[PDB]
């Protein structure tokens, strides 16, 4: 009973969405901007702040309440339409069904929207980490550098138009476009001082990786004078390009996907970011170097063997894994985990378009909430004792015994319990990987799920336990309604999401 | 041990906006405790050559070869999966550039 | 045993106590992130029940 | 152990009795029954058990097992 | 006495001089400490095993007992330099090597005992403590101001800074009162 | 810093002043003035820190007629998917 | 009624303890400590009766259910588990001794931490545990098998490092942590190996597919590998990390520092018959094992020897019982490497049972000892734990296997069936003959040396434990409870294990169907015995006989009484043999 209402109630939600969001900000920009002549916080009660603040929250909630019935719309759509082409057994009809425009608004960019699962997992990522970053990062904000508070609607919206093209160099430039906000984040809103050199090497890191992928876009775009991922089915690359093509994409989307050799400066950055930028960087940044390097992946025909891939892919998460141990800082411990958990989602796109990607899609939104919530305790830690240090802090159990408890389920979903969606991922990409190599699946669940696992766990139970005894004066309160119902939320998604619908994945 | 006089301290950028949580209480720091936080982030080699041989050098010898390794045993499980006619280490193309779930549609 | 105190007399048996949440039950600002995030939840819950279910 | 006293600010769980614990064990458990017997009932629509005593099955009845047609 | 025997990396010529003498350096103690910390030790050791031992013999413990306090009577006389002296130091450090036992009952006294530190006490800064006034009055002025001080309102245990504009009534008359007053007036 | 207002307009806080009683009265040359305000908070007396003081039924109404219509949705559905007006409920049902 | 038959409460009751378990920890301030008490003493007790009822008709008769919670989880590409549970012999036989054991325990965790400050947090803990355990042993896919076998790990992990508050108990934590966290890896290996190659997790279909892949191999890097040898392989390492087996036991005596009821449910049944459960679940996978049937007896036996004489010279009363919990765990490996599979259910009744009775009277003698868990520092306590010196000696006496005890006939049984065949069988059976011969050894020391030697404790406790204005009607260095729950614990423990003995032993076989189809002539010789059997029966006999009289007769002190006591062993020896011959020859 699938017929045309589903199809343009799709459609238009999926272009309104977009318009509601960048009139939002439009709107809260013009009032921003003419209100006052400097643009900088009056320090008073009746600051316009204030209201931006509240139209910024407001805005992102409610777009994610429309994206979530517009995602469930695309599914039903999708479904359906690979009906229409399945059943169509009889040789003289064929699925011939041309759609017409909406008559309000212009395509964004003169473009057509076309839609993917994994793009719509990665707007929804994009939403919830954007909504608990901006949410972790009120304090941060006061006099002179407000303006930080509009980042993550341009965050939504660059994403969003990355996400829904067709157009290869409309991908790259939305890619290229997430670099700047990052950058003036680390670098204006960030209390350490240390942090003014992570920026820079934040950025130059980064930008070696861009220059990479576009020397690959470029090859693509001259060889093959178009900017459709559909015209690319009619030209063929030989040997050469294809494997120039594929080196360079892989090693410049694992330069912000943090492959073996190169995560120095995810390591500085996260060390000396603020708390918020720091659950975005990990929860969602991260990802667009997994999206991008995907459709490269599926849209060009190779002939290499993917060993080599695999193996630095394998390399970076044991040495991420073998690292956990001797770490005091937490901050420091997160980040570990989430390189090796990048890795490891890395690696499932190492086998094209077979079905290693679904373990790949899953374990993405997986890490996406396990690194925002471990970034948030460290948060909570640190705001709450003023250090992150093991040697400094530790009894967070029998004083705050909420925070304690937090940790401690926390790594427990970190574990794996076969309830979450960290088990199926797992899983998924150990069942391919045994077949396909049964030594190295094994060597790699041992340095994973064990030495790395220790590590983790006895830097993280040696700060929940034993007394804190050095300053009673000023030992904190417990946890607030917001970081409760934060966590409580990250728990919820994950045993939820267990119970997706099977037609993806 | 008489207490660190001189160390790595925490600092901020100027014009900081201070953390105020739970009152806004912040104690005196632990010179030793300091230390030990700053001291890693700052440690640095002395001369050329003394990475291999600080620790073991058969240990650091085998981490360093971890790469190496792990090529070669995954060349002979190749070796291995071509024989049987298993899953080989490669980008497979069988979907011919459609995406995995990606609306297909035309206009007019 | 011997000596055992029952909990009238016992000064220091305790009855429940303590604040759930570091919130100021008499607190006189407009916060609005908790209601923020049980809108969070109500929604994605609504929003199971009535669409995804059945 | 000696008691020593605890902060009333904190919620935590030493030496604490509640006067009212009966109506509260009441409320808890009741409640917790219902609940469990609706699992329970919808639970035993997908259980299975093997034939009584003095019941064999009939190899080419229905509820047999059955093979695949190619 | 802190019983931090096995949960220090100690080697064992540390853990020796922890047992037989009250410190890891004997050397700083003088001919008397030494001799007084030795024969206290001995008699701890000989009570450990063979009064409170498995088959205890009284008899054979108390003519142990009496030989010993014996030599240790002839080792306080003695002189710090002595060879003899340095003999009996030997002897009695074989003892107490002798009948080490890995399984030493600690006494539940001591500061690293099995049962220690099993509880946190709380001080009076953490009994004292109430941000909200539940439990102890709280002043809407949120403290009182010394002199030699401006009055400041004191840090919320919660900045949250996620509020809106000041919330009045529906219909809230807020008209300028006293200037629509004077300006009848004149 | 903060910044908002804590005379409120929408009710008056809940307050006591027989706590904290001002001098005003017998001082001598050495000591300092007294202090001016001194009310302090006075709670509803049947206030538990320890847990929600919630006595709404507002979020279990809502749940609860968010499941009814889980319930009649895929009633309807169901019956749509059968090609029916309703249900065909047959005589007996058995285990899965 | 037939509606009780046909549709299971089983599940009703154990739904309710879970749910009051959580819900009691949740809500916590709203009931005190008698509320959290009452509620879940109410919820296991209705669970205990449920499951007591349908004890007898999953034993005797044939029944038993496979219940489905509904769809779980995908886990590939259009595949789906479901949460299924499987209440058969296999499972009933471990979940009944986890229930019973842990409703005992239950009641005497009360009396035991007395006026401690977090006596709730205890039960809840011991709830939640045996509310893990049971779940695991009622799996009925792999998923729920490890689901189970990690919940486990983890709520150990919180009854031991119980005192969160020391650094000390952390590490002891930390390293059945490590333990547990290699067990999974294992596991779960080993089921991605099962998916991988049949598709499937649900355990019952794998119990009827396996034999079709038994001239099956797999391809490791330079190495081409039995499918069944790999499997049994990593399924035997778990199995032998949970069960503490020689090597991987380390982290058990560590593991004592946890509260005495805490140490009786992990170290009686739950955590260390966890792995003997596994080997209980997949019988035919480790039927076609060549790794099995050499690795099962030389590691069983090597660690029964182990385990018994170390056990024979610990002080500490929780050491000793750890020793002899791991002796008794190499003795079921061993016993399962028999091939009866009903000698294993009986030696886990038996030992579970009088493991859980002795730790819980040794429990409130370190109760009365003020923590003091080493018997160098106590002696003449059967004045002051009259009750503890009674049922401490009917628990040794059965637990160490004496003879005219039920715990003889799991040593027999077990002896019966002892396969000859192996190359290192000289080895195997010394090491058993040497560790069955070691319960004497540890029974009499703890008995005697707590109870009837010398005063070798403090002062304090004796002089303050008997004051005049101590003396009432009302005076006990115990509780009453703990009392009748361990006379109730003892009770039911003989009324149990002589039921399973007459469905098993007797002529007449009436137990259920063990769903194995490997069977062996080890009855023949527990049915028809032959001469030189008996007389190998009678060797061990008389090597324990003269222990005996070692332990008795051996004077280590000068006494008043040395003199008499060689008088009274030359006595005994006379008598006995006049006895012999009076008895055999003239009337
Ligand atoms: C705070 C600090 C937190 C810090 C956290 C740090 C992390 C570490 C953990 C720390 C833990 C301790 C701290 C907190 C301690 C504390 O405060 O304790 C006191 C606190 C009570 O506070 P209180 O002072 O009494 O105030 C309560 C109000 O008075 C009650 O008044 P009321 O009568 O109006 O009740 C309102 C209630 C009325 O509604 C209900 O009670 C029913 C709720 C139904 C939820 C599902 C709805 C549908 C949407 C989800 C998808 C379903 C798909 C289909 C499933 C089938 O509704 C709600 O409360 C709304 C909550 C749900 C919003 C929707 C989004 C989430 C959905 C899932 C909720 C899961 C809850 C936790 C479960 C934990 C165990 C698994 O909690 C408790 O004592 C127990 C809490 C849990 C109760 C669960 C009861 C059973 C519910 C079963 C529903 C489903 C039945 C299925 C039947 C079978 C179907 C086949
Ligand atoms: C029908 C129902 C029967 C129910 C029987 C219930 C138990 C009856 C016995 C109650 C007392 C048990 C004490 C257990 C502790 C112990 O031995 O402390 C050392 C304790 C050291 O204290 P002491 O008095 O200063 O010793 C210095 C002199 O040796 C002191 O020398 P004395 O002049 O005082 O003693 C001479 C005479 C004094 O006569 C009596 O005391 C007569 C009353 C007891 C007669 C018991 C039957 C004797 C014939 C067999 O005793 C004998 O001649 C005993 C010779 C027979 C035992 C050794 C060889 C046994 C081989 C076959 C064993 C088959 C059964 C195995 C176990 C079955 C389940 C329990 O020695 C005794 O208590 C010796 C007297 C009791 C001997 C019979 C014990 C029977 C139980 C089996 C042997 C013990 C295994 C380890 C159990 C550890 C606890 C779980
Ligand atoms: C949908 C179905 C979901 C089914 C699974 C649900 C799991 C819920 C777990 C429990 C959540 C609340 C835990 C509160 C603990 C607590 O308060 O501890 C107090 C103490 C601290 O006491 P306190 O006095 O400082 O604090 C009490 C006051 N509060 C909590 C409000 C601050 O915490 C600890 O000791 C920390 C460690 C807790 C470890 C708990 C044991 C493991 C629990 C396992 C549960 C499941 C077992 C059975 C298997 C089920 C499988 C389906
Ligand atoms: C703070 C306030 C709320 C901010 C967020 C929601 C903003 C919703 C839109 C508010 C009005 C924006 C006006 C922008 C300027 C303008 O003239 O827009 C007209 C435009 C249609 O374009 P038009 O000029 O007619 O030319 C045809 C080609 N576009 O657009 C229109 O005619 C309006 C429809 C645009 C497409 C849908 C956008 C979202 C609609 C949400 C409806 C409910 C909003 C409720 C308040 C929130
Ligand atoms: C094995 C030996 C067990 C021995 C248990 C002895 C303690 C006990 O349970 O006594 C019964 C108890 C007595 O209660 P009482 O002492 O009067 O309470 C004082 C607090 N006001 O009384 C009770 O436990 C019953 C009181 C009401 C309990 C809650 C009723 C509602 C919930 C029922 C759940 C089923
Ligand atoms: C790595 C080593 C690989 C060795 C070669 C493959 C395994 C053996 C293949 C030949 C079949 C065979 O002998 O199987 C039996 C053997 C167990 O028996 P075994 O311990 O050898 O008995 C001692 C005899 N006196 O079975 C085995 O040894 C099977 C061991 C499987 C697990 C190996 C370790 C994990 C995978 C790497």
């Known amino acids: 009973m699938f017929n045309l209402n589903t199809i343009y109630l799709s459609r238009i939600f999926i272009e309104f969405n977009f318009y509601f969001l960048f009139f939002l900000f439009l709107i809260s920009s013009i009032i921003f901007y003419f209100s006052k002549i400097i643009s900088i916080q009056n320090l008073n009660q009746n600051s316009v702040f204030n209201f931006l603040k509240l139209a910024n929250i407001f805005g992102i909630l409610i777009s994610f309440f429309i994206h979530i019935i517009s995602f469930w719309f695309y599914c039903i759509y999708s479904y359906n339409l690979s009906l229409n082409i399945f059943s169509d057994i009889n040789l003289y009809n064929s699925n011939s069904i041309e759609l017409l425009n909406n008559s309000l608004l212009p395509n964004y960019f003169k473009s057509n929207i076309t839609i993917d699962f994994f793009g719509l997992i990665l707007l929804t990522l994009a939403y919830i980490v954007g909504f608990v970053s901006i949410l972790a990062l009120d304090t941060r904000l006061y006099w002179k550098n407000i303006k930080y508070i509009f980042s993550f609607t341009i965050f939504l919206l660059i994403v969003y138009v990355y996400v829904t093209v067709s157009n290869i160099l409309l991908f790259f430039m939305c890619y290229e476009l997430l670099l700047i906000p990052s950058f003036l984040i680390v670098y204006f809103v960030s209390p350490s001082r240390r942090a003014i050199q992570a920026s820079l090497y934040f950025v130059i890191w980064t930008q070696l990786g861009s220059l990479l992928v576009l020397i690959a876009i470029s090859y693509i775009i001259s060889i093959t004078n178009t900017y459709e991922f559909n015209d690319l089915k009619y030209f063929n690359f030989t040997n050469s390009e294809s494997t120039i093509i594929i080196f360079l994409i892989f090693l410049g989307f694992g330069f912000k996907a943090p492959i073996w050799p190169f995560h120095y400066w995810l390591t500085k950055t996260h060390v000396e970011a603020p708390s918020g930028f720091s659950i975005y960087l990990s929860g969602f940044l991260v990802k667009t170097a997994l999206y991008g390097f995907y459709k490269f992946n599926t849209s060009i025909f190779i002939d290499i063997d993917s060993s080599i891939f695999i193996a630095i892919c394998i390399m970076g998460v044991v040495d991420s894994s073998l690292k956990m141990w001797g770490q005091t800082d937490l901050k420091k411990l997160v980040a570990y985990g989430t390189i090796q958990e990048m890795n490891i989602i890395y690696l499932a796109f190492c086998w094209g378009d077979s079905c290693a990607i679904l373990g790949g899609i899953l374990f993405s939104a997986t890490h996406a909430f396990l690194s925002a919530l471990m970034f948030f305790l460290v948060d909570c830690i640190y705001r709450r004792y003023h250090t992150r240090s093991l040697v400094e802090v530790n009894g967070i159990l029998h004083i705050t015994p909420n925070l304690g408890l937090s940790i401690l389920f926390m790594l427990v979903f970190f574990s794996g319990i076969p309830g979450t969606i960290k088990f199926i991922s797992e899983f998924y990409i150990f069942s391919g990987l045994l077949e396909a190599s049964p030594f190295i699946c094994f060597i790699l669940m041992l340095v994973a799920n064990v030495l790395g696992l220790i590590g983790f766990s006895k830097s993280w139970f040696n700060a929940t336990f034993g007394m804190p005894k050095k300053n009673t004066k000023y030992l904190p309160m417990d946890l607030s309604f917001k970081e409760s119902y934060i966590i409580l939320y990250c728990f919820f998604f994950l045993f939820i999401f267990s119970y997706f619908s099977s037609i993806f994945f | 041990a008489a207490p660190p006089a001189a160390f790595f301290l925490y600092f901020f950028v100027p014009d900081n906006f201070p953390s105020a949580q739970s009152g806004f209480r912040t104690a005196s720091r632990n010179p030793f405790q300091v230390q030990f936080v700053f001291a890693y982030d700052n440690w640095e080699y002395k001369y050329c050559g003394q990475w291999w041989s600080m620790g073991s050098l058969a240990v650091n010898v085998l981490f360093f070869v971890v790469p190496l390794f792990l090529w070669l045993i995954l060349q002979t499980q190749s070796d291995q999966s071509s024989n049987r006619d298993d899953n080989s280490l490669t980008f497979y193309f069988s979907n011919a550039g459609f995406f995995f779930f990606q609306i297909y549609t035309n206009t007019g | ?54 | 152990f000696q008691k020593y006293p605890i902060p009333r600010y904190l919620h935590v769980g030493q030496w604490i009795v509640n006067k009212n614990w009966k109506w509260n064990t009441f409320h808890m458990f009741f409640p917790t029954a219902i609940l469990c017997f609706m699992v329970w009932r919808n639970s035993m629509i997908s259980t299975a058990k093997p034939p009584n005593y003095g019941e064999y099955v009939d190899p080419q009845s229905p509820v047999a097992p059955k093979a695949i047609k190619y | 006495s802190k019983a931090y025997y096995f949960v220090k990396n100690f080697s064992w010529a540390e853990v020796s001089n922890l047992l037989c003498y009250g410190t890891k350096y004997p050397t700083v103690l003088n001919h008397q400490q030494k001799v007084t910390r030795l024969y206290r030790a001995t008699l701890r050791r000989v009570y450990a095993h063979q009064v409170e031992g498995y088959k205890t013999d009284f008899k054979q413990y108390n003519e142990n007992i009496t030989d010993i306090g014996k030599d240790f009577n002839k080792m306080l006389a003695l002189k710090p330099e002595s060879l003899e002296l340095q003999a009996y130091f030997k002897k009695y450090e074989d003892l107490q090597e002798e009948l080490f036992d890995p399984a030493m009952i600690i006494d539940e006294s001591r500061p690293y005992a099995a049962s220690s530190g099993r509880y946190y006490i709380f001080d009076d800064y953490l009994l004292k403590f109430d941000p909200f006034g539940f439990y102890s009055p709280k002043l809407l002025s949120e403290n009182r101001p010394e002199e030699a001080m401006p009055f400041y309102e004191d840090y919320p245990q919660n900045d949250s800074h996620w509020n809106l504009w000041e919330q009045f009534p529906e219909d809230f008359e807020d008209s300028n009162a006293e200037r629509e007053a004077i300006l009848k007036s004149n | 810093r903060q910044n908002f207002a804590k005379n409120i307009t929408t009710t008056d806080i809940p307050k006591d002043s027989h706590h904290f009683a001002a001098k005003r009265s017998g001082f001598t040359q050495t000591e300092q003035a007294p202090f001016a305000y001194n009310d302090v908070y006075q709670y509803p007396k049947d206030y538990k820190p320890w847990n929600y003081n919630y006595k709404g039924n507002g979020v279990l109404l809502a749940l609860f007629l968010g499941s009814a219509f889980s319930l009649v949705a895929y009633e309807r559905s169901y019956a749509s998917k059968t090609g029916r007006y309703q249900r065909k409920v047959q005589q007996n049902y058995y285990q899965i | 009624l037939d509606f009780l038959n046909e549709y299971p409460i089983i599940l009703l009751t154990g739904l309710l303890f879970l749910f009051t378990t959580i819900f009691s920890l949740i809500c916590l301030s709203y009931l005190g400590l008698y509320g959290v008490f009452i509620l879940n003493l109410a919820s296991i007790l209705l669970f205990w009766l449920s499951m007591l009822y349908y004890f007898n008709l999953i034993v005797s008769e044939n029944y038993y259910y496979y219940i489905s919670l509904g769809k779980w989880m995908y886990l590939s590409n259009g595949f789906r588990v479901s949460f299924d549970l499987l209440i058969d012999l296999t499972s009933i036989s471990f979940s009944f001794l986890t229930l019973t054991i842990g409703v005992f325990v239950y009641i005497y965790t009360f009396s035991y931490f007395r006026y401690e400050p977090l006596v709730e947090r205890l039960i809840l803990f011991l709830n939640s545990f045996m509310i893990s355990m049971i779940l695991l042993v009622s799996s009925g896919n792999f998923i729920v098998l490890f689901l189970g076998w990690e919940l486990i790990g983890l709520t150990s992990f919180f009854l031991i490092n119980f005192w969160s508050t020391r650094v000390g108990t952390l590490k002891a934590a930390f390293k059945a942590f490590s333990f547990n966290k290699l067990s999974d890896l294992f596991l779960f290996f080993a089921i991605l190996i099962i998916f991988s190659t049949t598709y499937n997790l649900d355990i019952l279909s794998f119990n009827n597919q396996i034999y079709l892949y038994e001239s099956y191999n797999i391809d490791m890097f330079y190495w081409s590998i039995n499918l069944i040898e790999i499997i049994s392989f990593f399924f035997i390492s778990c199995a032998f990390i949970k069960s503490a087996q020689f090597g991987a036991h380390i982290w058990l005596p560590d593991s004592m520092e946890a509260p005495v009821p805490a140490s009786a449910l992990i170290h009686s049944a739950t955590l260390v018959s966890a792995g003997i459960y596994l080997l209980l679940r997949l019988s035919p996978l480790f039927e076609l094992s060549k790794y099995a049937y050499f690795i099962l007896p030389l590691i069983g036996s090597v660690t029964a020897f182990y385990g018994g004489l170390v056990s024979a010279f610990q002080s500490d009363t929780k050491k000793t019982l750890a020793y002899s919990t791991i002796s008794h765990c190499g003795f079921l490996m061993v016993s399962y490497s028999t091939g009866v599979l009903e000698f294993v259910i009986l030696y886990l009744y038996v030992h579970g049972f009088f493991k859980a009775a002795t730790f819980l009277c040794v429990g409130n003698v370190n109760r009365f000892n003020r923590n003091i868990q080493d018997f160098k520092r106590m002696g003449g306590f059967y004045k002051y734990l009259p009750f503890e010196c009674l049922a401490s000696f009917v628990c040794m006496i059965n637990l160490s296997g004496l003879p005219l005890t039920l715990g003889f006939y799991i040593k027999h049984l077990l002896f019966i069936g002892l396969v000859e065949s192996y190359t290192l069988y000289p080895l195997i059976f010394s090491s058993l003959i040497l560790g069955a011969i070691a319960g004497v050894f540890y029974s009499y020391r703890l008995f005697y040396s707590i109870f009837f030697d010398t005063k070798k404790g403090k002062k304090a406790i004796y002089l303050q434990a008997s004051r005049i204005i101590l003396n009432s009607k009302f005076y006990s260095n115990t509780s009453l409870a703990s009392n009748l729950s361990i006379t109730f614990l003892v009770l039911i423990s003989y009324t149990v294990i002589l039921y399973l003995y007459c469905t098993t032993l007797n002529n007449y076989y009436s137990l259920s169907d063990l769903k194995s189809i490997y069977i062996n002539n080890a009855y023949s010789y527990f049915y028809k015995p032959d001469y030189n059997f008996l007389n190998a029966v009678s060797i061990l006999n008389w090597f324990v006989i003269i222990l005996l009289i070692s332990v008795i007769y051996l004077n280590w002190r000068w006494s008043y009484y040395y003199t008499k006591s060689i008088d009274s062993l030359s006595k005994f020896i006379l008598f006995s043999f006049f006895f012999f011959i009076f008895s055999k020859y003239i009337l």
């Open chain 3, 1 to 54: 045993d011997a000596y055992y105190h029952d909990d009238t007399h016992e000064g220091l048996m305790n009855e429940p106590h303590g604040y759930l949440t570091m919130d100021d039950p008499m607190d006189l600002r407009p916060n609005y992130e908790k209601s923020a995030l049980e809108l969070l939840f109500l929604v994605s819950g609504g929003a199971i029940l009535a669409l995804m279910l059945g």
